C-alpha cells in the first residue's frame, strides 16, 4: 500500500527492478525478454477520452447535395425563396425528357413548371390563378442548362 501511494502521489517507481521482473540475474534467455512481448499483443491499447470536433460551413452542406432528380432543384437559401436547378437530359433522372421532341429539339415540358409549382408547395391544396409560357426552353445534349 505504501509503494502504491508513493507511486500515486508523484514519485516515479521502477516497478520492474523493484520486483526483480526484468533480468537482474546473469542468465535470462531470449524468451525471458520477449515472451510477454509476443503474448500481450491482444491487450487493449490506450483508451482515449474521445471528444467530437468538426467544422464544415453550411455552404459545403449546400454543395454536397449534388444534382436533383426532380425538376424543382435544390434550394439556394436567400431572400425570397429561390429554387435553382441544372439539367443534362442525357442523365438518368431526366432521360425521359428526350421523348419530348419538337421541330427536332428537346423542348422543356410545359407541365414541368406545373410540377415545380406543386413541389415547392407540396402537400397543400393549391390554385394557380394564371400561368404564361413566353419563351421556349431548349435542352441540348451534354450541356448543363
Amino acid at each position: 500500500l505504501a509503494i502504491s501511494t508513493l507511486y500515486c502521489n508523484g514519485v516515479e517507481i521502477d516497478f520492474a527492478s523493484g520486483q526483480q521482473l526484468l533480468p537482474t540475474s546473469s542468465s535470462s534467455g531470449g524468451g525471458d525478454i520477449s515472451s510477454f512481448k509476443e503474448s500481450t499483443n491482444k491487450l487493449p491499447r490506450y483508451q482515449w477520452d474521445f471528444e467530437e470536433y468538426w467544422d464544415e460551413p453550411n455552404q459545403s452542406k449546400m454543395v454536397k447535395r449534388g444534382p436533383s432528380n426532380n425538376l424543382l432543384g435544390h434550394d439556394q437559401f436567400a431572400g425570397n425563396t429561390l429554387m435553382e436547378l441544372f439539367i443534362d437530359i442525357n442523365k438518368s433522372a431526366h432521360q425521359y425528357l428526350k421523348g419530348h421532341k419538337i421541330k427536332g429539339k428537346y423542348l422543356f415540358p410545359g407541365s414541368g413548371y406545373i410540377d415545380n409549382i406543386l413541389r415547392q408547395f407540396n402537400g397543400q391544396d393549391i390554385t394557380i390563378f394564371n400561368l404564361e409560357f413566353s419563351n421556349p426552353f431548349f435542352l441540348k445534349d451534354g450541356v448543363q442548362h
Binding site: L1, I3, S4, Y7, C8, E12, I13, F15, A16, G18, Q19, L21, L22, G29, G30, G31, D32, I33, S34, S35, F36, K37, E38, S39, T40, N41, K42, L43, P44, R45, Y46, Q47, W48, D49, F50, E51, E52, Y53, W54, D55, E56, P57, Q59, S60, V63, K64, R65, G66, P67, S68, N69, K91, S92, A93
Partner: protein
C-alpha cells in the same frame, strides 16, 4: 564449413517492430485485423449522407455508391487535450492528422516502447498523402476563413505535427505519388536508416474522403467500379472502389532491434521505386509492363535473393480489366520460369478485403504482409469466383490464395510488395521472415513456461495502470475486467505483470492494483474500502 559470423552486411536489413491503423471494417490492432482477414471481412460499405448525398450515384455523377470507409464519427473523434492541442484549434486540424497522432501513439503502445524514452532522439518521419478534402471543405467560402486553417490542414503538418508532438528530430517529409505514396515513404525510410541519418524511422500514409470532387473526377474517366465491389483478378473486374483510413509502421535497424529484444514482425531486404516514363507506354494513365518488370528485377537484384525463393507477392491488383493482366504478365515474365504448378507462386491483394486505399494502399499492403509473415500464414482473398480470361494461370504457374495457407515449417519465406501509382510510379520492396530461427526457439521459450507452480510465483505483484485523464484510466481498467475469460487461458499472469510494468508509460492518473493471478485480479480489483 562454419555457420558463424553471419551479419546484416546489407544496410538493407531493416525490421518492422510495430504498427497501427484505422482501416475500413473496424481494424484497430494487429490481432483484430488478422482475425478479420482470416474470416474474409469485406470492409466495403455504403457512403453515408455525411460525406455526400446519394443523389450523385443515382445520376451516375459518382459511378458507384460504395466505399471502404471508417465510421464517420471515427474521423471526428479525438482527444486534443492529450497532445497539447487547445480545443480552440481542434476543429481546424485535419482529421487525417488526427488519425496519424492517435494511431501513432497506438503503434508505440504496440511496439513495447514508451514514447517517453524516444523524446529528443532523431527518428525520421515519412508519411504519405495526396488529398486535402477537409481543407476544401473549409474553403467553400472565401469570406469567413479563420487564420488557423492552413496550420491545421497544410501538407507540411501531416508529418511535422507528429514530429513536434514526439520530438522526432529526423528528416520529416510527406509524399504524393498518389497510389504508391506511402510505399514510397517506406522506401525513403529505408534510405534514411541505411545511410546513417537516423537510428529509427516512422513511416505511413493517410487518405481521407470528405468531398465528392475527386470521386466524381475519377468516375468520369471510369477508373472507379460500376457495381460497387472491388474484385481482383476476375472477369467481373470493372474498377476499384476508393476507401479511407491510414496507418504507420516503425522501422528500426535489425541489429538494434534484436539487441533490445523487441517483437520483430519482418525484415525488409530492400527494394527500389522507378517510374514508367514512356517505356512501352502510350500516355500517363497506362501502366507499363516493361517498367514493372524492371522494377521487380532491380529490387530482386538489390535484395540479394533468387526469384526462385519468392513465396508470395502482394499484387497491386485493383480490379480493372486493363491493368490487372498487364501487371500479372509482368510478374509472370519473372517468376513463371522458376516455379511449377504443384508449387506455384501465390499472389493476393488487400484491396479485395478492405477496398482500395486511394493514398494509403502501400501501408495497407505493408501491414498485411507483415502480419502474414509474423503469423506464418497466408490470408484468403475474397470476391474470387472466376479468373479473368486474360490471365494465363497454368501457362505461368501462378495461383491465387483462396483459403488460409500455413507456411512450410522448413523454408525461409520471402514475399514481395507491388503497388503502382496511376501516374506511372511503381514502388516494390522485398520483405522476409526475421532471420532468427524459431524451430529451436521452443527450448528457450519454455524457460518461463512450466515455471508458474513455484511459491515465488504465488507472490502478489503491484501492477500499475496509467492514463492522462481519469475517464481513460477507468475505460482501460473496465476493458481489462470485461475480458476475464479470454485472458485467463492465453496469457500467463506473470507476462501480464511484466507488460503492465514495462510496456506502458507513466502518465499523470496513476493507479496501483495488487493481485497474483486473474481471480485475485478480479477480487482485489480495487482496495477502496475505507481508504
Amino acid at each position: 564449413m562454419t555457420f558463424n559470423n553471419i551479419k546484416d552486411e546489407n544496410n538493407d536489413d531493416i525490421a518492422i517492430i510495430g504498427m497501427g491503423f484505422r482501416f475500413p471494417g473496424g481494424g484497430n490492432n494487429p490481432d483484430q485485423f488478422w482475425n478479420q482477414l482470416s474470416n474474409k471481412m469485406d470492409g466495403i460499405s455504403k457512403i453515408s449522407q455525411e460525406k455526400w448525398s446519394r443523389s450523385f450515384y443515382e445520376q451516375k455523377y459518382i459511378n458507384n455508391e460504395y466505399g471502404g470507409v471508417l465510421k464517420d464519427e471515427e474521423w471526428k473523434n479525438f482527444d486534443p487535450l492529450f497532445f497539447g492541442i487547445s480545443p480552440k484549434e481542434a476543429p481546424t486540424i485535419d482529421p487525417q492528422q488526427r488519425l496519424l497522432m492517435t494511431t501513432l501513439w497506438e503503434a508505440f503502445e504496440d511496439a513495447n516502447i514508451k514514447p517517453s524514452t524516444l523524446r529528443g532522439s532523431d527518428t525520421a518521419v515519412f508519411i504519405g498523402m495526396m488529398n486535402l478534402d477537409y481543407q476544401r471543405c473549409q474553403f467553400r467560402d472565401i469570406s469567413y476563413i479563420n487564420p488557423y486553417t492552413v496550420t491545421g490542414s497544410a501538407g507540411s503538418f501531416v508529418s511535422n505535427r507528429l514530429s513536434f508532438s514526439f520530438d522526432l528530430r529526423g528528416p520529416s517529409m510527406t509524399l504524393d505519388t498518389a497510389c504508391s505514396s506511402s510505399l514510397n515513404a517506406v522506401y525513403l525510410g529505408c534510405q534514411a536508416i541505411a545511410t546513417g541519418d537516423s537510428k529509427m524511422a516512422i513511416v505511413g500514409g493517410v487518405n481521407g474522403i470528405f468531398d465528392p470532387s475527386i470521386s466524381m473526377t475519377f468516375s468520369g474517366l471510369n477508373m472507379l467500379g460500376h457495381k460497387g465491389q472491388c474484385r481482383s483478378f476476375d472477369a467481373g473486374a470493372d474498377g476499384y472502389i476508393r476507401s479511407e483510413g491510414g496507418g504507420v509502421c516503425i522501422l528500426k535497424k535489425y541489429s538494434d532491434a534484436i539487441k533490445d529484444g523487441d517483437r520483430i514482425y519482418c525484415v525488409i531486404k530492400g527494394g527500389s521505386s522507378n517510374v514508367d516514363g514512356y517505356n512501352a507506354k502510350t500516355n500517363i494513365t497506362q501502366p507499363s509492363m516493361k517498367a514493372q518488370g524492371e522494377n521487380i528485377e532491380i529490387a530482386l537484384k538489390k535484395s540479394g535473393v533468387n526469384p526462385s525463393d519468392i513465396y508470395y507477392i502482394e499484387a497491386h491488383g485493383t480490379g480493372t480489366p486493363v491493368g490487372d493482366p498487364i501487371e500479372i504478365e509482368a510478374i509472370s515474365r519473372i517468376f513463371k520460369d522458376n516455379h511449377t504448378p504443384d508449387a506455384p507462386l501465390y499472389i493476393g491483394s488487400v484491396k479485395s478485403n478492405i477496398g482500395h486505399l486511394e493514398s494509403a494502399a502501400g501501408i495497407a499492403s505493408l501491414i498485411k504482409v507483415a502480419l502474414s509473415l509474423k503469423n506464418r500464414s497466408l490470408v484468403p482473398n475474397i470476391h474470387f469466383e472466376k479468373p479473368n480470361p486474360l490471365i494465363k494461370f497454368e501457362d505461368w504457374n501462378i495461383r491465387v490464395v483462396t483459403d488460409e495457407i500455413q507456411f512450410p515449417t522448413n523454408k525461409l519465406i520471402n514475399m514481395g510488395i507491388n503497388c503502382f501509382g496511376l501516374s506511372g510510379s511503381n514502388c516494390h520492396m522485398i520483405l522476409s521472415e526475421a532471420p532468427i530461427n524459431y524451430d529451436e526457439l521452443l527450448k528457450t521459450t519454455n524457460n518461463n513456461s512450466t515455471s508458474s507452480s513455484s511459491n515465488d510465483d504465488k507472490k502478489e505483484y503491484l501492477i500499475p495502470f496509467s492514463a492522462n485523464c481519469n475517464i481513460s484510466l477507468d475505460k482501460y481498467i473496465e476493458k481489462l475486467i470485461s475480458n476475464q475469460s479470454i485472458y485467463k487461458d492465453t496469457i500467463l499472469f506473470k507476462d501480464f505483470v511484466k507488460h503492465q510494468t514495462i510496456s506502458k508509460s507513466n502518465l499523470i492518473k496513476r493507479k496501483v492494483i495488487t493481485a497474483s493471478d486473474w481471480d485475485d485480479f478480479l477480487n482485489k480489483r480495487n482496495e477502496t474500502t475505507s481508504t
